[PDB]
Write an enzyme that holds these catalytic residues in place. Structure first.
Site, short mmCIF file in Angstrom:
data_model
loop_
_atom_site.label_atom_id
_atom_site.label_comp_id
_atom_site.label_asym_id
_atom_site.label_seq_id
_atom_site.Cartn_x
_atom_site.Cartn_y
_atom_site.Cartn_z
N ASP A 16 0.76 -1.23 0.00
CA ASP A 16 0.00 0.00 0.00
C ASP A 16 0.77 1.26 0.00
O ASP A 16 0.20 2.32 -0.25
CB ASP A 16 -1.28 -0.02 0.94
CG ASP A 16 -0.89 -0.23 2.40
OD1 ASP A 16 -1.73 -0.10 3.28
OD2 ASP A 16 0.27 -0.60 2.67
N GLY A 181 0.96 0.89 12.06
CA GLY A 181 0.03 2.09 12.33
C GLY A 181 0.79 3.00 13.24
O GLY A 181 2.03 3.16 13.22
N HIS A 211 6.55 -3.14 14.09
CA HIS A 211 7.17 -1.81 14.04
C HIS A 211 7.36 -1.23 15.39
O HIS A 211 6.37 -1.17 16.08
CB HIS A 211 6.12 -0.85 13.27
CG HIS A 211 6.12 -1.07 11.78
ND1 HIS A 211 5.51 -2.09 11.17
CD2 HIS A 211 6.59 -0.15 10.80
CE1 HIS A 211 5.52 -1.83 9.87
NE2 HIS A 211 6.15 -0.67 9.58
N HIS A 235 12.36 -0.93 12.04
CA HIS A 235 13.18 0.22 12.39
C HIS A 235 13.95 -0.05 13.68
O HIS A 235 15.16 -0.18 13.64
CB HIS A 235 12.34 1.56 12.65
CG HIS A 235 11.59 1.84 11.41
ND1 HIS A 235 12.09 2.44 10.30
CD2 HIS A 235 10.24 1.54 11.20
CE1 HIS A 235 11.08 2.56 9.36
NE2 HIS A 235 9.93 2.03 9.92
N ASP A 293 8.12 2.71 1.97
CA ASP A 293 6.95 3.09 1.09
C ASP A 293 7.58 3.94 -0.11
O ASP A 293 7.55 5.17 -0.16
CB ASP A 293 6.00 4.14 1.81
CG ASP A 293 5.40 3.46 3.01
OD1 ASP A 293 4.23 3.00 2.84
OD2 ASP A 293 6.06 3.39 4.09
N1 LIG Z 1 4.94 3.74 6.84
C1 LIG Z 1 3.83 3.23 7.43
O1 LIG Z 1 3.62 3.51 8.58
C2 LIG Z 1 2.77 2.53 6.70
C3 LIG Z 1 1.73 1.84 7.13
N2 LIG Z 1 1.02 1.33 6.01
C4 LIG Z 1 -0.40 0.76 5.93
C5 LIG Z 1 -0.37 -0.88 6.03
O2 LIG Z 1 0.73 -1.45 5.18
C6 LIG Z 1 -1.24 1.23 7.11
C7 LIG Z 1 -1.54 2.78 6.89
C8 LIG Z 1 -2.31 3.37 8.08
C9 LIG Z 1 -3.68 3.16 8.22
C10 LIG Z 1 -4.38 3.66 9.35
C11 LIG Z 1 -3.65 4.31 10.39
C12 LIG Z 1 -2.27 4.52 10.24
C13 LIG Z 1 -1.53 5.11 11.31
C14 LIG Z 1 -0.13 5.31 11.18
C15 LIG Z 1 0.54 4.79 10.01
C16 LIG Z 1 -0.18 4.19 9.00
C17 LIG Z 1 -1.57 3.98 9.14
C18 LIG Z 1 1.75 1.75 4.96
N3 LIG Z 1 2.83 2.49 5.31
ZN LIG Z 2 6.97 0.22 7.69
#
Ligand SMILES: NC(=O)c1cn([C@@H](CO)CCc2cccc3ccccc23)cn1
Ligand SMILES: [Zn+2]
Length: 349
Positions: A16, A181, A211, A235, A293
């Site tokens: 994603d 998240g 994470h 991380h 990402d």
């Molecule tokens: N770098 C990242 O933190 C991250 C998380 N996702 C997706 C799952 O693969 C979740 C995206 C998301 C959804 C709802 C709340 C969030 C809160 C913090 C980070 C990502 C969230 C993608 N990149």
């Molecule tokens: Zn990540």
């Protein structure tokens, strides 16, 4: 140019956050959802970051774009396919790709994500489509690919279905569970729904990363290791602010999944300080280099290697080192792991 033009392994990249702009635009246009722009380059320029942002302003970006892909069978499978393709161009021979299956569904999921109306793509069905695309892209592109299903910090009610899904689809292609998240949510490593999913992951032989330590304190790392029992850390930077924790995790050879370029952009690492990954180098830590990402960060896996090469002095030998450590720390079967390593040690001489 390409800072390490040898085969690579990658363990930490979300699906994603690894979608082509042109494909976002394709399904947008097709399904009628509309997005801040209409060219690839302009959309890329909006989605992408060049500066740290608050949490809402980061998650906002997932509010634009995700509705183009979430809830549509064919989009879910295509994104999985084309991910594999991208990694092939980075020179990766093995990658573990992660995502939350609930975040791409529009039924049997509550709350329904991204403002979507109810439809009929379930989360189980999402895993199946993803599997298909990833197993087609493996077959077509020549990169071996496994996946990891993410529990969401703010939604422990989903977590036992994540782990049940990792069990149903095991080897096939899912090898592990993750917790993603917002790690700063108070108490969230310990919500019962997450603790019970990772205790079921132990019971049923599903591997585990979490994470932790990205933006969260050293205590969030400590909970990931001691209570969720994780095997690798997403991380893990702030482990360094607890010396005896740092020492113990080196003594047990814990794997740190580092995302150097992500860490700069997010503000996770402040640019005027020693980046944690140089300490990890100097310390001979078991760690990997990863994109996190590419879409949101305007990057490829060479971005991160150029950053560590050019900014931090990293050599060929260290690049070979940490790739090997990544393979050793993979969640593949024992046999498949030895096979990967045989491949790598051969390319590296
Ligand atoms: N770098 C990242 O933190 C991250 C998380 N996702 C997706 C799952 O693969 C979740 C995206 C998301 C959804 C709802 C709340 C969030 C809160 C913090 C980070 C990502 C969230 C993608 N990149
Ligand atoms: Zn990540």
């Amino acid at each position: 140019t390409p800072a390490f033009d040898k085969p690579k392994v990658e363990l930490h990249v979300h699906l994603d956050g690894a979608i082509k702009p042109e494909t976002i635009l394709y399904y947008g246009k097709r399904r009628g959802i509309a997005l801040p722009a209409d060219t690839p380059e302009e959309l890329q320029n909006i989605i992408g970051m060049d500066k740290p942002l608050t949490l809402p302003d980061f998650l906002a970006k997932f509010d634009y774009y995700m509705p183009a892909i979430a809830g549509c069978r064919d989009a879910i499978k295509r994104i999985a396919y084309e991910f594999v393709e991208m990694k092939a161009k980075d020179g990766v021979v093995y990658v573990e790709v992660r995502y939350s299956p609930h975040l791409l569904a529009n039924s049997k999921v509550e709350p329904i994500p991204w403002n979507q109306a109810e439809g009929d793509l379930t989360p189980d069905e999402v895993v199946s489509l993803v599997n298909q695309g990833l197993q087609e892209g493996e077959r077509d592109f020549g990169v071996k690919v496994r996946s990891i299903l993410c529990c969401m910090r703010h939604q422990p009610s989903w977590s036992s279905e994540v782990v049940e899904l990792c069990k149903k689809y095991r080897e096939q292609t899912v090898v592990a569970i993750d917790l993603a998240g917002d790690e700063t949510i108070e108490g969230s490593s310990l919500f019962p729904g997450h603790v019970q999913a990772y205790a079921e992951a132990v019971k049923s032989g599903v591997h585990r990363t979490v994470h932790a330590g990205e933006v969260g304190s050293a205590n969030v790392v400590k909970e990931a290791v001691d209570t969720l029992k994780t095997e690798r850390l997403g991380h893990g930077y702030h482990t360094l602010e607890d010396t005896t924790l740092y020492n113990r995790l080196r003594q047990e050879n814990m794997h740190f999944e580092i995302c150097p370029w992500s860490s700069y952009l997010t503000g996770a690492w402040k640019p005027d300080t020693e980046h944690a990954v140089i300490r990890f180098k100097n310390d001979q830590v078991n760690y990997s280099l990863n994109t996190d990402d590419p879409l949101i960060f305007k990057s490829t896996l060479d971005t991160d290697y150029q950053m560590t090469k050019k900014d931090m002095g990293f050599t060929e030998e260290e690049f070979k080192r940490l790739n090997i450590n990544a393979a050793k720390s993979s969640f593949l079967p024992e046999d498949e792991k030895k096979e990967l390593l045989d491949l790598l040690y051969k390319a590296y001489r």
